[model samples]
Target: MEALKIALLGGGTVGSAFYNLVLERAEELSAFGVVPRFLGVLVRDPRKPRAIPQELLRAEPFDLLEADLVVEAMGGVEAPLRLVLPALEAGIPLITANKALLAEAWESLRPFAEEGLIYHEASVMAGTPALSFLETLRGSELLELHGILNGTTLYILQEMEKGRTYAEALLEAQRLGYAEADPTLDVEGIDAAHKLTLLARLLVDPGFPFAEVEAQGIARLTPEVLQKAEARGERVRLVASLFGEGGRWRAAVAPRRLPQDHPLARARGNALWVRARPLGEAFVTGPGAGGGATASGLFADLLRFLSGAPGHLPAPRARPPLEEGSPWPGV
Candidate 1:
């Protein structure tokens, strides 16, 4: 039996889940005619106790090259970018959960996705199909993609709409482990922008930058705004919308008011809703964040990478559907 050697970068929340789940479910995975042999895990502090055994942890990144597969679960873009890019350049398959890195640097990184050497499944939306859904639109023309991709803001907004102040809602999110210590990314719309930027690269133009997209978070919507909108039977969302129009791609990430019937408005706490218009429209909505959901995404990538799945299809033929700075109303 060919032993599939795998290395992990980082052992934070998402990485720890990947390590534990894969280790605990090894037998089930082995029954499928493949066995994953964990080689090494890269961590900043080798002595720190992780969910996985310390013996599997390595203090450096380059040591991961010994494995046939590398999972870049690191939170930052630069560390994995430095490690995975070189690994793929040397014909190693990489699976990363780093949406921020993909959002910021996929243009330079995508060309390395040669046969037998690539990275797949960028991140997760609460275990729902995200990258895989984009994979389905590989050949067809995908004109528009609008997403509510940040869970923290969703949680906060849900609570805020339920009569809690923005601070109280944010506190609740933190208490529930939905918001990180630094909630700026989630509340400020930076994380959603990152995910949307990555989606843009995969479904629209590989050369698109995160800076090109307009971004706004739920922070601008004070408690008063939420109360007014709710009283008016409307809900606000930190929506990321991308459309192809007039020979160019346009996108925005901002808080907008939508009726209860709007899919995005109906999306409650921590759920991600993606509306894609290919031929007409397609909707994917489910949990958008959390360790288990993220672990599921990592597992999907493991299956594809280990099974030697075919490389991604060529870019789609459609142009963006909306022009830049298109007019829209608010809450």
Candidate 2:
């Protein structure tokens, strides 16, 4: 039954979708008693022309916007920090979809996440709701995590399974718009690495290092590799995993062979499998949602923010920090 001033960063697909979705669902958002009054979008080019109103777009002076909540679908690590950090410092809440910003800057964002000031359910597997699900394991300890967190990688791997060469599959992926032209982030595991960093930060440690995560890629993968796994009744998938034992935690993302029936293998999409004490093995699967899924995530956060819901925290950890004179190993 009130207005919540919202400053949205980025006018990209997800940002614009979130903007429109919130506006389209005004009556629904109001049923919960809050309407978002957008404070215009901050983008690199306000004159590039877009579907959203031209006047509601602008360039520069990001910090000057006064609002009740900040939504960052803008992406990247540095620029978003300038806007999000200062706004949170001003005690405003936030909803973001950038895993790079959340994972790469975990240390800086830790306190905000801990205090429930930041909400990023869309950070990893935008459509899967993996991060939100982790929040419900309040009394459990997350012992293991694994998944095919990159849809682009999954598409190529599955294509290779159908007898396509890496080059052929990659080209087809690009043709279908499933992959970027540069493609390093998806094929080389950087994308999944960032996603894993955020996942581990939520379920493992507040101090998990994004730098330590070496997300090896599948660019060099060969059909021979796929055939070798098939001979053993296994399938290869690019999987991101984190393991914790007696307080020592490590994370990694790479092409891994799994049993033919493994959850990650069974779901050819961007899937995530989690293991928690008392909860046992669980998985969330299917491809990433486009802008629509991300917009849905942002709207969900808006609803939660209005409803006064508690946010996620790191799962109960194993005792004592990893003994060191050495670096932590990767999973």
Candidate 3:
């Protein structure tokens, strides 16, 4: 069997699941002819409970690793970026689920990004095929892209509409595995903002800044506000929004009150909506969290790689980069 050496850069929820599920489908994956052999598993905390054994646990950074493909399930920017850069430099392709790294450090990663060598379908919406859906657009004139990007915040907002206080809703989100104890990013809209930043790269401005994406969390959203909106036949959703035309672009992630029938507002979980010249209107929705969904995305990339497909797609159109103080007039 032809061996594909894969170095996994995390052993957390996404990492363990990716490794296990790949093994679970090893026979089917090998039927295509290459057997993916895990080279080693890297982890920050070997003490952390995971399926990877003590012998396979790694303490070294990614620069010290050797593999055919690097799988970065690590969730943060700095550490994962350290691992990913050297791998890319080695001419090894990557399959990652880290949106924050891509969103916050796009300039540094641009060389590999534009070359279509980095596969990151798992970044934006877990296994929802969000970026894959973008790739299928074939550079249609994407008029507007909006999404309920953060399932935790959306679930919290939905619970708040049920009269649960913000604290109670957040607590329930954590208990239900929808959120972490430190959900500051998810609740504060930074999670959605990071995703919006990455999505903007595929849909509009390749040079969009994560810092410039306007964001407001659901922290101050009172149950009464939700109730008031509901009384008027509306729902509050934490939305990530974007649109561009004639080199003008705008994007934001914030709490918005929308009518019940609205596409974005209609999402009870995670969903991405697009308005384009050809398709007119479309959307994709699914589980936006957890190991199962996220690992599915990682698995998808492996199949794409083995099938000889490009890892990442080139930017839709090379428009002028959106920068500070651009003339995008608000209506």
What range of 10 consecutive residues in model 1 has the weakest lDDT sum? 318-327
Candidate 3 lDDT over residue span 257-314, tens digit each: 7777886667646999877767678888887877888899989998988888878754
The CA lDDT of each predicted structure is 0.70, 0.75, 0.78
C-alpha TM-score for every candidate: 0.88, 0.88, 0.91
Residue-wise lDDT of candidate 1 within 1-331, one digit each (tens)? 5677888887877788888888777876675576778888888997776788877778876565667788877777776788777677767777777667777776667676424355545464645777777777554566456778887788777877677878887777676545444789788888888887777766767667789888877756887887788788887777887765566787778888777677677754333333343445556677776766677777777777656685342244334544333323654
Rate residue 65 of model 1 by lDDT.
60
- Roughly what TM-score does model 2 have, to 2 decimal places? 0.88
Clash number for candidate 3: 0
- lDDT of each residue in 185-211, candidate 2, tens digit only: 788898899988877767666667898
Give all candidate RMSDs, comma-separated.
Answer: 2.9, 3.8, 3.4
C-alpha-based local distance difference test score of model 3: 0.78
Clash count for candidate 1 is: 8
The lDDT of model 2 is 0.75
Best by TM-score: 3
